[PDB]
Design a protein around this nucleic acid. Structure first.
Lengths: 46, 91, 25, 80, 129, 140, 150, 108
RNA sequence: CGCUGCUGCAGUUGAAACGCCCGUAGUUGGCCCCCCGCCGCCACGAGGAAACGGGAGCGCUCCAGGCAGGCCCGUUGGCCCCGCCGCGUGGGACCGCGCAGCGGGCGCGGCGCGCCGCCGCCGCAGCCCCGAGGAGAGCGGGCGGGGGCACCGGUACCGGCCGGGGACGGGUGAAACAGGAUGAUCCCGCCGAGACCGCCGGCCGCGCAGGCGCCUGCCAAGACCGCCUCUGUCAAUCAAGGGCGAAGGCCGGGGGCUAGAAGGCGAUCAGACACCACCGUAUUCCCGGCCGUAAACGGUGCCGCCCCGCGGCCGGCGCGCGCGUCCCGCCGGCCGCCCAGGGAAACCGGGAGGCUCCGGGCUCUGGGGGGAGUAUGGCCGCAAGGCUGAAACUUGAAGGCAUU
RNA sequence: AAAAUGGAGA
């Protein structure tokens, strides 16, 4: 049974689960990758 | 568990004999007689009654001159502090 | 206090029945 | 005397309960405070629950009380 | 706790009108209490109303024509067939001249008069004298 | 009264009505079922039987005269119950054991008027109506 | 109803009507996100997270600045509380109350609170078991209540 | 047929109180149903105040003033006439009558 | 006879809110997502034996009757019944609940297509309503005779001890019972236990209620108010089930200062069994258990809503003011009087009002006065007693508040 | 200080 607990962990890993960087890709994103919101000239997209 | 529902379990060792007053009074005293109280120095509940009056704690390896049926008889427990009161007052 | 001296009288009547019911059986 | 419930009168509204008013709104405000030594601006709630320390001075600029937060340094009024 | 908003509104409106205060407040706006109020305004018992809106329950401010005699609710809704609409008019309406019982029918929510004439009977939400 | 009212509460009201129905003295009288067994008469207009010892029950107040009644054992339940005689001086006709029918006092259980402790009323003796015996309409 | 306690009070407070961000808005909504995780890194529970952000920093309302709840940014991030703070804190209270009851058993009144708080904990946890917050197996018990902190 | 709204007591937000016994009856009474008149009286009688003041061996002496509470039971109060049963109109009058701000146990 | 109450009854005093609180089923859950699908739900059919009854036409010598009658609707006997809890048909208002990201391509992927696969594929605005004068948690500050555990200071009362002094002392409504020249009462010092926490002490405050008052501390809280703090309906009342619960009682110890059920006296009165004096045991105080009841009463269950004004007291929290416990609100609780309104009245009116114009929710209880809390079973307790709970029979009022 | 009755039924 204890081994199947490890198997349950395996199925969880495939799910997005823990993506701390994805939630924190906001303040860090606003310093480097922010696009044309103020004085940037690259407005046109795709 | 709870083999004999009535509270007279320690004193169930007697059976139908010896009346209903004596058996009940014995239950309280007998349970107190074999109880593990806490020796002062050892501070662990390892004391039993070696013989009426003298009780000793296995860990503390010390013999306390307590009561016949309990490490601290109720009247003495008071006298303790009354000696302390007179003494603290003396100096 | 009639209620008290009726109720406790009733209790004395109730107790009399108990001895009468058991001793007779 | 002309008093109208539909168009709510603001003067009485202030004295009214934060919930009893025709609209249940906040009854507290954010106040920036002026540290006398330096001009860093610290925003504090009208009623403070946790202490805010003026940047550059470890000692809390606000020691919270059940309602108004007093300040060890001089106070900048509201937002001004 | 508060289960029937309309009873707390009906006695809110009726009690206020009893003192003669035209403007009244209601703690929660309901789309069903909108139905009773706008059918009251439609029959002319109540005057222009409004809901000051927070994002929560909302409060209803209603001005009155001052003519309301009685209003009330049947809790909870009891369903009557369109055959029995008139027995309920006898018990809960003073006269058949000013009779109005709020019925709920799937095809629109109307007062008792129009519904039986439309041969549909649903549940009696509240009484309107 | 608290009252429990909801669209799905036909339970509270059904039990309550059943339990609180048997509170009336009259309801319990006809619904306990004790009354058919308890009444000397088995719930009937009249009961045949044989006459036993005659009786002179003192009245109460205002009425202050002895009212002659006869105690008869109803044949069907083998029980002895007293029956008030009809009109003035009508008891002299009734003496030893004779066929007697007994009927209710209207109240159906309570003793009639102010004559205490009598629940039933004789209506016949022998094979002739006892109210005709009084008028000598029908008599031995 | 103040739940079990009879005493009734209104202690609620009114947050700002604008659903959109406050005007001054000293930081960016994006800037707000890194401060909230930092509070998970500081170890602040979610209730205390809003309180400290509220006075220490200008941010006072979370939804207005960013469209989420204190816990929803944290739930997407690594620190997601399985036992919501509102239960974790009440379990913490039962242990603390048990400590008085074990030391002295003569306090029937404190025993009434330890009975009241146990009962409140059970009600809140039946909610979190029907929802996905707490596992169906999770059941409050008397002995491991101390260990539930882990 | 409730006689008084107070019910002879000032108990509000309460359930039970302490018992003080009547000086006359000796009857235990809860603090709520007891009269509790506070009385200030000079220790000597007023009649012999003059001769004792005349014997003022110490300078500027003043009479011994005693502060005590009198708490008669309900039955003790009526028979010793501390208070008198009154009519419905008089029931709500919250004041002791016959003025008397004079400082002695006897009102004189 | 709305005196069985669903419509449509009472429960502050007639009959009646569990002593108190938690609590599982049960019942009941605010706004709120138009459109989809199920619930329930009405409209509304199909097919549902009559007799009987509602009800065509009809003059037995008139009906009650019957369905006959006459140159006649193919003359009749038409029609509504049957409840049929299903079954169609439709509305979807209300009513409860709804999950799996969609979608496209390959797709006729077998007389038409689905499954199911396989593709981020590009069409996704792909994705967490709100933040309840619901509740839970949180934080800041005060709040209280609120609780436990130690600790401890007073005086009193009683009992000793020494000293002094000098006959009476006690007790009362008067008296007497028992004190006292081995010296009482009395007057002071010295002391020993045991309870008790005085005046301050209250339309004060606290607490689930019973209840809560020595000084020092110590432990766990509770309610409260304030807040741009999260939680997101976790809610209400609650059978069964628990937890407490004054005194008295009981069961073993410990303790024993005063009062003091019993029991003794004296003194009362034709009796004094008693009232009153004087002793005095159980008890009272503590610990460990049982009891589980009180006029446990506010004689008024709980959670909600709306109110008519005038003042207090306590808890915060703001309001300006020459800053004074100054005013003025937000108040949460304590309340007094009371306006309509209600009530058989008395009275209530921070309700017992909004209600014969009689329908927020939810537990409990009553049905003339006896018998009767009895009998009989069960349960509980060691017992006392508790808890549950009829009848046979009686008999005409019992009762409620008010007027002289 | 003591201090007890008041037949039935207009």
């Amino acid at each position: 049974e204890q081994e199947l607990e490890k198997k349950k962990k395996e199925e969880l890993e495939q799910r997005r689960k823990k993506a701390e960087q994805r939630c924190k890709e906001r303040a860090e994103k606003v310093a480097a990758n922010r696009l044309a919101f103020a004085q940037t000239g690259i407005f046109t997209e795709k | 568990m709870a083999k004999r529902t009535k509270k007279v379990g320690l004193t169930g060792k007697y059976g139908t004999r010896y009346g209903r007053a004596a058996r009940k009074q014995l239950l309280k005293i007998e349970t107190s007689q074999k109880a593990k109280y806490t020796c002062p120095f050892c501070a662990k509940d390892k004391v039993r009654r070696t013989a009426c009056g003298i009780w000793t704690c296995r860990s503390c390896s010390k013999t306390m001159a307590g009561g016949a049926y309990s490490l601290h008889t109720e009247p003495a427990n008071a006298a303790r502090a009354t000696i302390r009161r007179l003494r603290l007052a003396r100096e | 206090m009639r209620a008290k001296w009726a109720k406790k009288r009733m209790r004395k009547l109730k107790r009399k029945r108990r001895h009468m019911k058991a001793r007779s059986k | 005397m002309n008093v109208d419930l539909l168009y709510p009168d603001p003067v009485e509204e202030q004295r009214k309960h934060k919930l009893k008013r025709l609209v249940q709104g906040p009854n507290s405000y954010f106040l920036e405070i002026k540290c006398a030594g330096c001009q860093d601006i610290v925003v504090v709630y009208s009623h403070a629950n946790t202490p805010v320390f003026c940047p550059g001075c470890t000692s809390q600029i606000s020691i919270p009380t059940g309602g108004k937060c007093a300040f060890t340094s001089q106070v900048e009024r509201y937002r001004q | 706790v508060r289960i029937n908003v309309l009873r707390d509104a009906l006695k809110s409106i009726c009690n206020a009108q009893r003192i003669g205060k035209k403007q009244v407040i209601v703690r929660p706006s309901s789309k069903v209490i909108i139905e009773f109020l706008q059918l009251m305004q439609k029959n002319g018992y109540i005057s222009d109303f409004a809901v000051v809106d927070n994002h929560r329950s909302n409060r209803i401010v209603v001005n009155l024509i001052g003519r309301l005699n009685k209003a009330g609710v049947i809790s909870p809704r009891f369903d009557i067939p369109a055959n029995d609409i008139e027995k309920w008019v006898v018990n809960l309406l003073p006269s058949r001249l000013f009779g109005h019982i709020i019925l709920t029918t799937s095809q629109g929510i109307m007062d008792h008069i129009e519904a039986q004439h439309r041969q549909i009977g649903g549940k009696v939400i509240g009484y309107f004298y | 009264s608290g009252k429990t009212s909801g669209l799905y509460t036909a339970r509270k009201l059904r039990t309550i009505r059943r339990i609180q129905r048997w509170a009336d003295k009259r309801y319990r009288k006809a619904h306990l079922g004790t009354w058919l067994k308890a009444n000397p008469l088995e719930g009937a207009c009249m009961a045949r039987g044989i006459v036993t010892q005659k009786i002179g029950i003192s009245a109460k107040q205002p009425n202050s005269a002895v009212r002659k009644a006869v105690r008869v054992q109803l044949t069907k339940n083998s029980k002895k119950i007293t029956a008030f005689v009809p009109r003035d001086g009508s008891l002299t006709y009734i003496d030893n054991n004779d066929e007697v029918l007994v009927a209710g006092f209207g109240r159906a259980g309570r003793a009639v008027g102010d004559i205490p402790g009598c629940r039933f009323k004789v209506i016949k003796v022998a094979g002739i109506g006892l109210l005709a015996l009084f008028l000598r309409k029908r008599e031995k | 109803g103040r739940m079990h306690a009879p005493g009734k009070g209104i202690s609620r407070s009114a947050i700002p009507y604008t659903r959109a961000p406050a005007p001054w808005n000293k930081y960016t909504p994006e800037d707000v996100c890194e401060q909230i995780y930092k509070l998970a890194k500081k170890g602040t529970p979610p209730s205390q997270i809003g309180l400290i952000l509220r006075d220490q920093f200008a941010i006072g309302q979370v939804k207005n600045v960013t469209g989420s709840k204190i816990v929803r940014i944290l739930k997407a991030k690594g620190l997601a509380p399985e036992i919501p703070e509102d239960l974790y804190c009440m379990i913490k209270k039962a242990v603390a109350i048990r400590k008085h009851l074990e030391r002295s058993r003569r306090d029937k009144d404190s025993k009434f609170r330890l009975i009241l708080v146990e009962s409140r904990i059970h009600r809140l946890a039946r909610y979190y078991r029907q929802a996905r917050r707490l596992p169906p197996t999770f059941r409050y018990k008397s002995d491991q209540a101390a260990a539930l902190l882990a | 047929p409730v006689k008084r709204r107070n019910n002879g007591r000032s108990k509000y937000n309460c359930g039970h109180t302490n018992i003080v016994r009547c000086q006359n009856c000796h009857r235990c009474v809860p603090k709520d149903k007891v009269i509790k008149r506070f009385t200030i009286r000079n220790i000597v009688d007023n009649t012999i105040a003059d001769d004792v003041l005349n014997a003022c061996v110490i300078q500027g002496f003043a009479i011994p003033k005693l502060y005590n509470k009198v708490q008669y039971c309900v039955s003790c109060s009526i028979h010793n006439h501390i208070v008198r049963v009154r009519s419905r109109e008089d029931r709500k009058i919250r004041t002791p009558p016959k003025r008397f701000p004079r400082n002695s146990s006897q009102k004189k």
